[PDB]
Amino acid sequence: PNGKKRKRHKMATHKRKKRLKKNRHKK
Amino acid sequence: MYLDSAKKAELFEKYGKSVKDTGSPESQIALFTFRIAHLTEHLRQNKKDFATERSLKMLVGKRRRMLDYLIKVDIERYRAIIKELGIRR
Amino acid sequence: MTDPIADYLTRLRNAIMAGHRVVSVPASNIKKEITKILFDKGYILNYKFEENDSQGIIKVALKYDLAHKVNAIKKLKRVSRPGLRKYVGYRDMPRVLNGLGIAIVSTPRGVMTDKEARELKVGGEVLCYVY
Amino acid sequence: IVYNRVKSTNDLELKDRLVAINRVTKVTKGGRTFTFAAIVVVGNEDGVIGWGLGKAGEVPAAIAKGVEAAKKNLIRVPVHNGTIPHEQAASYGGASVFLKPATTGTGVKAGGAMRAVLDSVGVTDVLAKSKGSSNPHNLVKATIQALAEMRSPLMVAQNRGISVEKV
RNA sequence: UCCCAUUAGCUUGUUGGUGAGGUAACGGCUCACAAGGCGACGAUGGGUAGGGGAACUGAGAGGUUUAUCCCCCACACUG
RNA sequence: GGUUUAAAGGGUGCGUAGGUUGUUCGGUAAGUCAGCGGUGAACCUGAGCGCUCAACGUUCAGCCUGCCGUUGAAACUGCCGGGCUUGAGUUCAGUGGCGGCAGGCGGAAUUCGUGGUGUAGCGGUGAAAUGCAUAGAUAUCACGAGGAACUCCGAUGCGAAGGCAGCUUGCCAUACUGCGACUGACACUGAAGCACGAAGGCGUGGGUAUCAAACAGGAUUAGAUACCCUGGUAGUCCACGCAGUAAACGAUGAUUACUAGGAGUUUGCCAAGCUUCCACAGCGAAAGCGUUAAGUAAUCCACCUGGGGAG
RNA sequence: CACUAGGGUAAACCCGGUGACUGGGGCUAAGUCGUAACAAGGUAGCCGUACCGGAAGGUGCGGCUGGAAA
Ligand SMILES: [K+]
Ligand SMILES: [K+]
Ligand SMILES: [Mg+2]
Ligand SMILES: [Mg+2]
Ligand SMILES: [Mg+2]
Ligand SMILES: [Mg+2]
Ligand SMILES: [Mg+2]
Ligand SMILES: [Mg+2]
Ligand SMILES: [Mg+2]
Ligand code: NA
C-alpha cells in the first residue's frame, strides 16, 4: 500500500496497449 | 421433476425389499435416474436454466457414486440394477 | 476425521491450554492404550472408560501441580501422521527431552514406550512424543 | 512463570557485560536529537541473570542505567554444573534460538549476544544456534526465555509425581 | 542410474506361436500363422555425460568432481 | 521456510487419475519388527611399529550403519471376509427466502407528435457564450405514441461464485431443524477435463426514450487534445451466438475436530442454524486475528524463492 | 544375383550466419515540453475494458478502498 508499486504496473500497461493500438490495421 | 410421495413409494416398492426401504442403493439409484430424466425434459425447454443444470450434474455424480459402491460391495446387484434401468450409455 | 490419534492429542492439548480439569474423547482401542500409558507414566491424574451405545467415551482427569499451577504435560506431538508414516528399529528409537520425556510407540509386542521397547528389543511405529 | 529474585544484596557477584551500543536519532524543528541505548546483562555465574536497557545522552550514563535496570529485573535459571538439562528452542520477535547440551570438554559454541548471556548465566558446555534476526534485544530476550523454559530432572519428576524416569 | 511434456503417443520382426537354420550358448538371432507389445509408475523424440570406489566438503542430511590411485566399459585418422 | 498487508490462494464449482480413510471381530503377511547366514584393494577412526621428528609408509583392532537369502512376531498401515451406527446419504414433517428460467399485468417520471391558452424569454455557469425562440419557445391543459427503470418498504436475506429488488402465476432448484423410518463408511480432496462466469467488446436480426466513448461547438488558461456548458454517434435494451477478463477482494482454497468472555441481530422452538462489532489464551514484524481465527491439530489441491528486462 | 560402406540426385526438416530497411529495451548525463502520481497533490486513487490524444494522459461503463471530508 505504498502506491509506486501499482504506478509502475499502470505505466507498463499503458505502454503495451499503446504499442498494440499502433500495430493494429497494419499488415 | 413431477415427483411426489406416491411416486417415491412406488419406486421404493419396485426396487429394494419392502416399501419402507428408502435408503437402499437400488432405491436411491432408481430415484436419481427418475428425476434425472425429468430434469432433462425440463432443461430441453428451459435451455437457459443453468441452476437446474449442475443440479442435474450433482444428481449424476451421486448416482455414479452409488453405482461405485455397488461395484465395491456386490457386482451382481449392480448388473441387475443397470439392466433394469438402462443406465449405461 | 483423518487422524483420531492426532485428534486425541489435540483435545488434550487444548484442554490443558484452556485450564480444564476433565476432557472427554471418543473411545478407541489404541486411544485406550495411550491413556493407560499416560496414567502409568504419571502425566494424567486419572481416567475412566464409559461404554455407552456408541463406540464409548474416555474421560480423562488431568494433573495440575498445586505448587506452581502447571500441568504435568508440556508438549504433545504427533510423529507418524497418515500422510507420512514413520517406523524405527529398537536401535534407532528416539529419545525425548534427553530422556526426560516419553515416546509412545506401537510394537508387535503391543503399545508401549520407547524405554521398554529398547529393553525388549522391538521396533515399530512411533505414535507420539510426550513431555 | 519466571522464577524471579529480589535485589541480590548478598549475591553481589553480579558482573555486568555489554551487548550493544546504538546511537538513535529523534527529529525536531531545530534539528536532530541524538541519544544512546545500551543493553546490559548482569550475571553471578549462576542461574541468576538479568537484562536491562539503559538510555541516556552519554555512553557511561547509558551503561549505568542499563546496569541498574538489569539489577532490578532478575530471574533464576535451572543450570546444573556448566551445562543445560536438555535441548530448548525459543522465539522472541524476529529472533529464534536453539540450545543443545554438549560434552563436558566442549566450551561455548556461540558468539555475540548469546555468548554474553551464557557467560552471565554460567553455562560452559552448550551448542547454540540463531536462526532468525541478529537483533541484540530480541536475541538476548529469546536466549533468556529459552533458559527460563528449561527443567531439571528433579523438577520433571516433581511435576510428574514420580521419582526416577529411568534417568 | 541427468534435464526438456515450449517432446503424447510409439511400434510391423513389432509382440506371441509352429517349424527350420545358425551360434560356445538360449533367443525374431535369421527365415517361412495370430494381432499383439510398450505407454502420465513418462513410451517416443531432443539435449548432455563414460560409470563406480576414492578425493574434497559439511555436525549430519547432503553437495562437487572422478587430476594423480584401483575396478568396469568404449576406442586406436574416419567408415 | 512460507502465501491478509513484504513474493506467493486458482474467479467459482463439478469431477477423472492420484493421495488420505469412523468403530469392531477374524484371517493373511505386502509394508513394519526381530533372529541367523552370505556379501560388501586402497583411503578414512582408536592402538602400535618404521621414517633422527613430521609429512608419510605399514600392521592390527574397531566401521561396515547397504544388498541378498532364510526363519519367526502380529500392535499399526495394506488386502480379504463379517458386524455396528455416530460420519455420509435416502425418506417423512415443519419453516423460509431480491435463488433460477418462462409467460402475463401495473403506476410515477422522461422523450416525441397534434390541438387549445399566452408572449419576451428560456436554458446554463464561479461569470458567460454556444443552443432553442414572433415562420410563436419556456410555461399550462388535453389527445396520441414509444422505450427504459422500478420511490417508500430497505438494512436484512438468498445463491458455488459472478450476482439477485414493481406485482403476479407456472415450472424447477435448494438451505436449515427435527424423525423414534431406511442403507450401513457408501467419506474428504482433487493434476487433467467440463460447466458457469460483472462491466466493456464482436457477429446476425429487432428496438432505439434517457444517458453517453468518439466527434463538433462555447468557455477557462501562457496553451487545454481536459476538468465546466450546449449538442451528439456507437453503446446502454431484447433474442441467439462468440469472447473468458476484474481491486472476479475477506487482497485470507476446501474439509474435520477442539478452545474464553461481553454487545447487538434474522429465523423454527432456553436453544440451535446464521449474520455484524469489542475482545482471554494463543498467534503475528507490526497493524492486527481471535469460535465466521490469521489459535490448537490432521488430509488433499494451488502458488512463492531479490528488483528491472517482462507477463 | 542379393547384402553394403561410399557416391550422386532431388525434396522436406532441424541447426547456424548474414541482409537494404524497420522496431522495443537497459544504462549515463542532462538539452526540450509539460505536470501525471505522492496532501482531498489542487478533477480522490486504483482494477478491467473500449475509444481518442506531442507525451505524461483524458473520457465512457462496471468494480474496489489499498480514500479524505462527512
Ligand atoms: K483404519
Ligand atoms: K465484486
Ligand atoms: Mg494510458
Ligand atoms: Mg503481495
Ligand atoms: Mg477466492
Ligand atoms: Mg489474484
Ligand atoms: Mg497533478
Ligand atoms: Mg489528481
Ligand atoms: Mg475526448
Ligand atoms: Na450488439
Swiss-Prot record, chain B:
Keyword Cell membrane: no
Iron-sulfur listed as a keyword: no
GO cellular component: a single term: cytosolic small ribosomal subunit
Pfam families, A to Z: Ribosomal_S15
Keyword vocabulary terms for this entry: Ribonucleoprotein, Ribosomal protein, RNA-binding, rRNA-binding
Role this protein plays: One of the primary rRNA binding proteins, it binds directly to 16S rRNA where it helps nucleate assembly of the platform of the 30S subunit by binding and bridging several RNA helices of the 16S rRNA.
GO biological process assignments: translation
Protein name listed in UniProt: Small ribosomal subunit protein uS15
UniProt cross-references to InterPro entries, sorted A to Z: Ribosomal_uS15, Ribosomal_uS15_bac-type, uS15_NS1_RNA-bd_sf
Listed HAMAP family: Ribosomal_uS15_B
Protein family membership: Belongs to the universal ribosomal protein uS15 family.
Disulfide bonds: none
Subunit structure, as described in the record: Part of the 30S ribosomal subunit. Forms a bridge to the 50S subunit in the 70S ribosome, contacting the 23S rRNA.
From Swiss-Prot, chain C:
Described purpose of this protein according to its UniProt entry: One of the primary rRNA binding proteins, it binds directly to 16S rRNA central domain where it helps coordinate assembly of the platform of the 30S subunit.
PANTHER family assigned to the protein according to its UniProt record, in alphabetical order: 40S RIBOSOMAL PROTEIN S15A
Keywords for the protein's UniProt record, in alphabetical order: Ribonucleoprotein, Ribosomal protein, RNA-binding, rRNA-binding
GO molecular function, one term: rRNA binding
Assembly information from the UniProt record: Part of the 30S ribosomal subunit. Contacts proteins S5 and S12.
Biological process (GO), any one: translation
Family stated for the protein in its record: Belongs to the universal ribosomal protein uS8 family.
A Pfam family recorded for this sequence: Ribosomal_S8
InterPro entries the UniProt entry points to: Ribosomal_uS8, Ribosomal_uS8_CS, Ribosomal_uS8_sf
GO cellular component, one term: ribosome
Protein name as annotated: Small ribosomal subunit protein uS8
Keyword Aminoacyl-tRNA synthetase listed: no
Domain of life: Bacteria
Gene source species: Porphyromonas gingivalis (strain ATCC 33277 / DSM 20709 / CIP 103683 / JCM 12257 / NCTC 11834 / 2561)
From Swiss-Prot, chain D:
Name the UniProt record assigns to this protein: Small ribosomal subunit protein uS5
Stored Gene3D superfamilies: 3.30.160.20, 3.30.230.10
InterPro entries: Ribosomal_Su5_D2-typ_SF, Ribosomal_uS5, Ribosomal_uS5_bac-type, Ribosomal_uS5_C, Ribosomal_uS5_N, Ribosomal_uS5_N_CS, Ribsml_uS5_D2-typ_fold_subgr
UniProt keyword annotations, A-Z: Ribonucleoprotein, Ribosomal protein, RNA-binding, rRNA-binding
GO biological-process terms attached to the record: translation
Pfam families listed in its UniProt record: Ribosomal_S5, Ribosomal_S5_C
Statement: the UniProt record of this protein carries the keyword RNA-binding: yes
S5 DRBM domain sequence ranges: 14-77
Domain notes: The N-terminal domain interacts with the head of the 30S subunit; the C-terminal domain interacts with the body and contacts protein S4. The interaction surface between S4 and S5 is involved in control of translational fidelity.
PROSITE patterns found in the cross-reference section: RIBOSOMAL_S5 (PS00585), S5_DSRBD (PS50881)
Biological role stated in the UniProt entry: With S4 and S12 plays an important role in translational accuracy.
Family the UniProt entry places it in: Belongs to the universal ribosomal protein uS5 family.
